[PDB]
Amino acid sequence: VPAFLFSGSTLSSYRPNFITIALPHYVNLPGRSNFKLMYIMGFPIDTEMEKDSEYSNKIRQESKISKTEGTVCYEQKITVETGQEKDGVKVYRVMVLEGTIAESIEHLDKKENEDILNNNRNRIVLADNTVINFDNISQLKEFLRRSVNIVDHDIFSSNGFEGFNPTSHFPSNPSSDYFNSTGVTFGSGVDLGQRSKQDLLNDGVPQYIADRLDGYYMLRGKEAYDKVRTAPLTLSDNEAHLLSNIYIDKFSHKIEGLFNDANIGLRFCDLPLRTRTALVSIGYQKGFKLSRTAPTVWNKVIAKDWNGLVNAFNNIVDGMSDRRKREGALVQKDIDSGLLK
């Protein structure tokens, strides 16, 4: 123990020095201190011990981030290690050294690395030098999977929020006030009334999906309405999710920028997933500039008053109040889960 130590492969953008490796080689990983690595064979080894040492790191603090419900900011590179620890002595093989989330997921999916990952303790060493210890490799991968998404797309397309309808639909009638502004709609509120095919292509929507919507583009009011009654179109769930997610993500990035531009002492990626989801949902419904479209929400966000933020969602009556309560409950969950406070 640790087992299969030199097996598999290791992902590092950093490949030290410039013969002669069967000898241990030591180096300080450049950006940070301490990060002390001991290279044996071609492989990086992270060791920690309580007692002072010249070649070992000091014991690292455990991150407060939840291994079960938590995420790491999607803008961070991470270090992934697998290994063993006892009695103030820690020895970890570095599987991924300061790589991106997506790279990490990819690398850990490699068959060659199975043995070492299944046979040891897996942990993430964060940019902040704290660590998250996982019960098992499957847990770590799922954590990573959560972390890569800006919003939780399943919640978003749940009936509780934006819903999901793969069939072309017109969510208005000739009597209603929004009739002329409503277009042919797909998935989780993707309205083509102001969008053209080229627009969708530009946003990264696949040609095969885009080609299908021909005739549904740019129709608004009567024409869009009529078109759905006369010639509806049903997408497969897969195509409708793909399309929705492009727009959910596109919109999310709008919300993200506002938050980050506010310079509030943290970035949007540092918020828990559900809260990001909450913020984006209300934006998607009420308009993206929350300073204007949801001031009472916005105030609490930028104040980092999480309890205050929940209350704010509960206290808005736009006639949308049910969804707003569901948004606040997302925030409250993060509170109850310890992701917030």
Q: How was this structure determined?
A: X-ray
Residues 309, 259: contact at Cβ < 8 Å? no
Residues 240, 169: contact at Cβ < 8 Å? no
State whether residue 223 is helix, strand or coil: helix
Can you give the resolution of this entry in Å? 2.6
Smallest CA-to-CA distance from 126 within 75, 83, 69 is with 75
Beta bridge partners of 187: 165
CA atoms of 205 and 47, how far apart (whole Å): 46
Q: What share of the chain is helix, strand, coil (3-state, %, to 5)?
A: 40, 20, 45
Look at the block and give the residue holding tokens 């080609």. Answer: 211
State whether residue 313 is helix, strand or coil: helix
**Could you tell me the sign of the dihedral formed by the alpha carbons of 47, 57, 135, 74, in that order?**
negative
Instruction: Give, in words, the CATH class of 149-341.
Output: mainly alpha
Domain boundaries of the chain, sorted by first residue: 1-148, 149-341
Tokens of 170: 């017109």
Smallest CA-to-CA distance from 210 within 230, 233, 226, 188 is with 233
Smallest CA-to-CA distance from 266 within 312, 306, 302, 294 is with 302
What is the widest separation between alpha-carbon atoms in the chain? 82
Beta bridge partners of 42: none
Tokens of 145: 């999977």
Environment class of residue 337 by beta-carbon count within 10 Å: exposed (0-12), middle (13-18) or buried (19+)?
Answer: middle
Strands (E), 1-139: 11-12, 25-28, 36-40, 43-49, 78-86, 89-99, 121-125, 131-134
